[PDB]
Write a protein that binds this ligand. Structure first.
Ligand SMILES: NC(=O)C1=CN([C@@H]2O[C@H](COP(=O)(O)OP(=O)(O)OC[C@H]3O[C@@H](n4cnc5c(N)ncnc54)[C@H](OP(=O)(O)O)[C@@H]3O)[C@@H](O)[C@H]2O)C=CC1
Ligand SMILES: *P(=O)(O)OCC(C)(C)[C@H](O)C(=O)NCCC(=O)NCCSC(=O)CCCCCCCCCCCCC
Ligand code: SF4
Ligand code: SF4
Ligand code: FES
Ligand SMILES: [Zn+2]
Lengths: 711, 88, 154, 118, 122, 51
């Protein structure tokens, strides 16, 4: 229940069983802290939160002090003042005078709280000197300047509890206590870059963002991660026309102060192989062209072909925003084509789940639903690779509750214990009626997560009716008023948005027609069978990759960092990206490339301001007008007609469920262009702990150095 | 009974719990599963949002689209209105 | 006509090749709002560009929340004219006269009132807040009757 | 451009760039502005990176050594360098080399070394 | 006009009959003055172009239905009139009110979608 | 008027069309620029960001 208490006179209403520092926050009182983090276990090591409590002879650590029904807390008494100066004097006695060479400079909690709660000068002048410690090699991404360690334990707590990667520790004793693996090892965790943000000081910094910028010079934009389907909320820090770093911003509904390594380091892949001008393939060589006469040769080729119904095909890639889907949907429709394919294999045929009910393809018990999950069945998903931050949230619930996890699919290296039931569809039918099924039947708030990797499995029609028929058999537990145990997990930020606007192949008939013309709209992971060789290929994108290699025209669009695109995450939340920079070269906004080629093909799409194109999106799906919120699905029971009724006679073949992510580091074109992910893969493969693995710096075998980064 | 050939996609826009959408919500809970059994080659998208005045959108070839509202209409009256949109 | 860009707005002295085409220019007739953008002496471009009203998120890098306490109104970056490279010194040149200007407001409705008074287009972003959860030092040492499934290391 | 050696060689002491985002002088001093120009009059300082690696190692018997830059209050903020790895430790501010006397045997056995070592 | 030749003490319109009387007297003075503005500032335009362009600047605020907004729009006019009739504005300020003496000219926004797309937003 | 110019030799120019601080990206040599005509060709290129 609620206890009541006074802090600096003022009554605060905090739940019983919480710490005092939590009530000080709720009461509007700033309490200095270093070790305590809202999302990490309580540690009382720093001693910077020492407050004065009535009926207590010593200062108490507020972070670890539970709130009681009647206590009095003075946070500004002379007891508190001399406590904070004394700790700030100890925290700075052995601290290296490395603020000009430190990357944490200008954004350091040790600096700010020294200015606010410390003394103005220091009393440490020992002829014997300060402590000094050697540096530690803990993989390519993290640079270590360990003299700066203040021993908060925030990273050992994060790596051991949130990341499930217990290789970081604390060896030694007393003043000679040190943070790092005793034997040099490469921190192997797709969440390991969060340690850099968690560090109060710059003892853990990022090797890519080594000495390039100062925090004060960065323009900060609150945008969305599109490198995965979860839609993680981020901050894009840029100095002029170059993105410097990508940080995590709080959103407890999605990502909770955490981002994965791909979404943090792939931004160096935004300045390396960019398409900056229109290209035409002439005599087998890509020639530069203007817009007026690359859009012309689009039209001339289209007139020459004179395609019939559905002979004009579009394939939408995995970084494509909803605005350009709706625009390309229209221009496709005015050309007599409903051939609206998607990048993944099986995406040029209709999907086993429909798109008629929104609940068919969404993560229906929202991401926040895991916080109360009791039993979870994972089907066709290695969530550590497909949805990293989501995987962590599963472990957080597992570590604190009686959560049972079972998986059907390919075994993976998991940060939580899970039962393996099998790899094929029979091993799902045998599980869902086996011992683990009664766990789903008995446990309240059950959760079945179906990976988007089964949608591309040949047996998905059988897989999807197997799952939902169990859900429909087991309602009032799976299908209560506020709960839905059916959840489909996207791994690309474009899939839920395409499904929302109906950007899919409608019928098997349109699927079998050979196209004479393919618009690869940011599509680069297309299966070769889905593009006929002799067709006319337009590639619209931002990075030169497989798609541009085969194109007949290349049209440069915008990356997600210089457009305000609409994206829908796997839970159905409609979020908006904010442009942090402008367009490079002659690139153009993606929806505008579609709208212009409407003039050149003679069917101009009506809207010609993006405000108008958002009014059109509202007609297709009104949820797309609601921002930063999930709109609940009303007819959630109507989902049986696609999942079970239209999936009744399924030609099961027995092929096992396949892995979808061969390389977590190389998933998209932004990632594959990134030098940092190049080093992350190479270090992973060869197990190299050296920070300067393919980077500037002196080595045993490089006395002279090296200017290559990423090679 | 199917939809007339030349119809490409039906789109019902309504609200999850508004009173203005209960009649539309009643229609689809009794209509859509039969509407999908007859012709599975057509998408029939049900898209809702808080405070969505009920609407229906019928698309045909070349991207021609018709919108008839549904406010005030009873459960019965909807069926003829959709029939007008899907019969030729 | 329903978000149609008025391509025939009369430009002014400060209109450039980077000025977007506006949809609505304060006529001076709209009810309950002062047409301050009409009498401000500002260019028409202020009425074409969108501003974002939001509460800045706390840095991931540090635990101070002083900058999250006030609403900021800033102008959105455009696809051309925000930054280009100077051919001579490599400096970054700009055409965006609003690039370094931001406004601070105590409440969301104070920012909305100012935006409508000046004729700005505005997108409001609702703050992301935490979910309270009681945290207890004592849990670090809770007893496991069964398998440990975690080796807490301080 | 091109014909004079000063227009071609990045510094008098060094011929190549020493960072990945450094512009070569060959590309920086191409174009119309560098026509009708004396390239031997152009500012061309000696590269610091070559000079710092010509510095002999300070051998020391201590685990932690103090570097202030060598000029009292005319140096850099005083810091402390740990010399416990079998490598040469370098001051972050000035670059001077330090090495513990315990690693002299190992260091003298390496074929190529980042500092003269004697 | 005590301190300066065309000075008018700042007055607040009493009502719409008064406010419209002042607007018409402001417009009358400006279009009367157009020959005098065209010789002093050596404007290479017909007096008719000057008068039709003066009309546009009143035509912009024809739909203002606020009395507090009209007075500031009237004070701005009176002050502009004073600095033009006294030779205080330079020819550069005056013939910069005509938005065709830009080297890009009157055509400075893109005409429609496609022409602004092929030129990169103009 | 276009933002892209492919020169007769084949190299592409990506111009930003503004005024003095802009990027015309055309490099020009005007022989006979100090007479009465040359000051008009010079001023027209230079004031739009060209060398
Ligand atoms: N303006 C007219 O009425 C007409 C002119 N033209 C031609 O157009 C061109 C430009 O006209 P305009 O500007 O009036 O010409 P100007 O006579 O005003 O200027 C001619 C230019 O040529 C340069 N020049 C002349 N002789 C030499 C020389 N022997 N060596 C080097 N530079 C030299 C001058 O430099 P400097 O000042 O140092 O001599 C000057 O920059 C000329 O060829 C002119 O004959 C054609 C038809 C009509
Ligand atoms: P009729 O009854 O149809 O219209 C009469 C009016 C216009 C009064 C309307 O009935 C009316 O009520 N409209 C609203 C009131 C109004 O017009 N408010 C504004 C009046 S002041 C004004 O418009 C000033 C305009 C600019 C003044 C300067 C013009 C010339 C400057 C440049 C000259 C050339 C270079 C030197
Ligand atoms: S961590 Fe903070 S206090 Fe320490 S050197 Fe870096 S900026 Fe200075
Ligand atoms: S390395 Fe950083 S986060 Fe880890 S204990 Fe030291 S100061 Fe704390
Ligand atoms: S904040 Fe409680 S001791 Fe660090
Ligand atoms: Zn030094």
């Amino acid at each position: 229940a609620e206890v009541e208490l006074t802090i600096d006179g003022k009554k605060v209403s905090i739940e019983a069983g919480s710490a005092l520092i939590q009530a000080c926050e709720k009461a509007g009182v700033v309490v200095p802290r270093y070790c305590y983090h809202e999302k990490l276990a309580i540690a009382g090591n720093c001693r910077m939160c020492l407050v004065e409590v009535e009926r207590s002879p010593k200062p108490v650590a507020s972070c670890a002090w539970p709130v009681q029904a009647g206590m009095v807390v003075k946070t500004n008494s002379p007891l508190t003042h001399k406590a904070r100066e004394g700790v700030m004097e100890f925290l700075l006695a052995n601290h290296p005078l490395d603020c000009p060479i430190c990357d944490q400079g200008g954004e350091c909690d040790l600096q700010d709280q020294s200015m606010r709660y410390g003394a103005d000068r220091g009393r440490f002048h020992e002829i014997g000197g300060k402590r000094a410690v050697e540096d530690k090699n803990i993989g390519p991404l993290i640079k270590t300047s360990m003299n700066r360690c203040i021993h908060c334990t925030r990273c050992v707590r994060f790596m051991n509890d949130i990341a499930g990667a217990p290789e970081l520790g604390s060896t030694g004793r007393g003043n000679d206590l040190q943070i790092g693996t005793y034997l040099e090892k490469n921190l192997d965790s797709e969440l390991s870059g969060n340690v850099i943000d968690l560090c109060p000081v710059g003892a853990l910094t990022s090797k890519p963002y080594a000495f390039r910028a100062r925090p004060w010079e960065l323009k900060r934009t609150e945008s969305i991660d599109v490198l995965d389907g979860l839609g993680s909320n981020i901050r894009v820090d840029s100095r002029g026309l170059e993105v410097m770093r990508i940080l995590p911003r709080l959103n407890d509904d999605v990502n909770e102060e955490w981002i994965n390594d791909k979404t943090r380091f792939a931004c160096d892949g935004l300045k390396t192989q960019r398409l900056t001008m229109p290209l035409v393939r002439r005599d087998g060589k890509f020639e530069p062209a203007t817009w007026e006469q690359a859009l012309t040769e689009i039209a001339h080729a289209y007139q020459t072909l004179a395609p019939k119904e559905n002979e004009f095909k579009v394939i939408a890639g995995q970084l494509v925003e909803v605005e350009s889907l709706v625009a390309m949907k229209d221009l496709a429709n005015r050309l007599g084509s409903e051939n609206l394919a998607l990048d993944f294999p099986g995406g040029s045929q209709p999907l086993a789940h429909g798109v008629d009910i929104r609940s068919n393809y969404l993560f229906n018990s929202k991401i926040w639903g895991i916080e109360e999950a009791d039993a979870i069945l994972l089907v066709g998903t290695n969530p550590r690779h497909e949805a990293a931050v989501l995987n962590a949230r599963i472990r957080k619930q597992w570590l604190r509750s009686d959560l049972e996890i079972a998986a059907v699919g390919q075994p993976w290296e998991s940060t939580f214990d899970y039962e393996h039931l099998g790899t094929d569809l029979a091993a799902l039918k045998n599980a869902l009626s086996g011992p683990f099924g009664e766990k789903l039947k008995k446990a309240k708030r059950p959760m079945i997560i179906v990976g988007s990797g089964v949608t591309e499995h040949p047996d998905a029609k059988a897989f999807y009716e197997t799952v939902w028929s169990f859900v429909e058999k087991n309602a009032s537990n799976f299908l209560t008023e506020e709960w839905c145990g059916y959840n489909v997990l996207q791994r690309a930020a474009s899939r839920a948005g395409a499904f929302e606007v109906g950007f899919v192949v409608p019928s098997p008939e349109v699927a079998a027609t050979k196209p004479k013309f393919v618009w690869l709209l940011g599509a680069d992971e297309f299966d070769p069978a889905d593009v006929p060789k002799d067709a006319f290929i337009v590639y619209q994108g931002h990075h030169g990759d497989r798609g541009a290699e085969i194109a007949d025209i290349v049209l440069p669009g915008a990356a997600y960092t210089e457009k305000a695109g609409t994206y829908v995450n796997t839970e159905g939340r409609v979020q908006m990206t904010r442009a942090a920079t402008g367009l490079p070269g002659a690139a153009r906004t993606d929806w505008k490339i579609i709208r212009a080629v409407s003039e050149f093909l003679g069917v101009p799409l009506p809207y010609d301001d993006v405000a108008q194109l958002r009014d059109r999106m509202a007609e297709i799906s009104p949820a797309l007008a609601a921002y930063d919120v999930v709109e609940p699905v009303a007819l959630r029971h109507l989902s049986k007609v696609q999942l079970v009724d239209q999936n009744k006679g399924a030609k099961v073949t027995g092929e096992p469920l396949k892995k979808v992510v061969e390389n977590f580091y190389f998933t998209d074109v932004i990632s594959r262009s990134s030098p940092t992910m190049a080093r992350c893969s190479a270090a992973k493969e060869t197990g190299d702990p050296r920070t300067n693995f393919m980077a500037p710096g002196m080595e045993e075998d490089r006395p002279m150095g090296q200017i290559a980064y990423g090679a | 009974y199917a939809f007339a050939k030349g119809v490409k996609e039906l789109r019902f826009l309504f609200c999850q719990t508004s009173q203005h959408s209960a009649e539309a919500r009643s229609f689809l809970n009794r209509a859509y599963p039969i509407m999908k059994k007859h012709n599975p080659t057509i998408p029939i998208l049900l898209r809702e949002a808080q405070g969505t005045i009920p609407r229906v959108y019928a698309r045909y070839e070349f991207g021609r689209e018709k919108m008839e509202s549904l406010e005030g209409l009873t459960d019965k009256q909807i069926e003829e209105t959709v029939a007008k949109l899907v019969k030729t | 006509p329903r978000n149609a860009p008025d391509y025939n707005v009369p430009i002014d002295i400060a209109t450039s090749t980077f000025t977007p085409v506006p949809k609505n220019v304060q006529d001076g007739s709209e009810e309950n709002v002062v047409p301050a953008g009409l009498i401000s002496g500002a260019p028409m471009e202020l009425q074409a560009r969108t501003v974002r009203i939001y509460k800045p998120a706390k840095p991931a890098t540090q635990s101070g929340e002083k900058n999250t306490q006030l609403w900021r109104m800033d102008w959105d970056v455009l696809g051309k004219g925000h930054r280009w490279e100077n051919p001579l010194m490599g400096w970054q040149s700009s055409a965006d006269f609003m690039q370094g200007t931001h406004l601070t407001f105590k409440t969301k409705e104070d920012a909305i009132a100012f935006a409508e008074k000046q004729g700005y287009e505005y997108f409001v972003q609702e703050p992301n807040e935490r979910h309270f959860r009681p945290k207890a030092y004592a849990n670090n040492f809770l007893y496991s009757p069964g398998k440990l499934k975690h080796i807490r290391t301080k | 451009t091109g014909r004079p050696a000063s227009a071609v060689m990045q510094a008098p002491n060094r011929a190549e760039v020493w960072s990945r985002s450094q512009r070569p002088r060959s590309e920086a001093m191409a174009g119309p502005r560098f026509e009708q120009t004396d390239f031997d009059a152009q500012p061309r300082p000696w590269a610091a990176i070559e000079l710092i690696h010509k510095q002999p190692v300070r051998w020391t018997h201590d685990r932690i050594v103090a570097c202030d830059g060598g000029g009292g209050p005319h140096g850099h903020p005083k810091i402390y360098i740990n010399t416990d790895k079998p490598e040469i430790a370098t001051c972050n501010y000035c670059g001077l080399p330090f090495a513990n006397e315990h690693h002299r045997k190992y260091l003298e056995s390496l074929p190529q070394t980042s500092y003269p070592l004697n | 006009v005590q301190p300066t030749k065309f000075a008018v003490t700042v007055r607040q319109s009493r009502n719409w009959a008064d406010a419209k009387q002042r607007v018409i007297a402001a417009y009358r003075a400006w279009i009367r003055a157009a020959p005098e503005i065209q010789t002093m500032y050596s404007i290479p335009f017909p007096v008719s172009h000057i008068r039709t362009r003066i009309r546009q600047e009143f035509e912009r605020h024809r739909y203002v239905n606020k009395l507090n907004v009209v007075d500031v729009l009237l004070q701005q006019s009176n002050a502009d009139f004073q600095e033009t009739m006294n030779f205080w504005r330079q020819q550069s300020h005056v013939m910069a009110f005509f938005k065709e003496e830009h080297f890009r000219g009157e055509k400075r926004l893109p005409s429609n979608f496609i022409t602004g797309f092929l030129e990169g937003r103009n | 008027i276009s933002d892209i110019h492919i020169t007769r030799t084949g190299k592409p120019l990506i111009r930003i069309q503004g005024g003095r601080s802009s990027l015309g990206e055309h490099t020009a040599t005007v022989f006979g620029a100090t007479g009465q005509l040359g000051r008009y060709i010079v001023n027209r290129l230079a004031r739009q960001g060209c060398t």
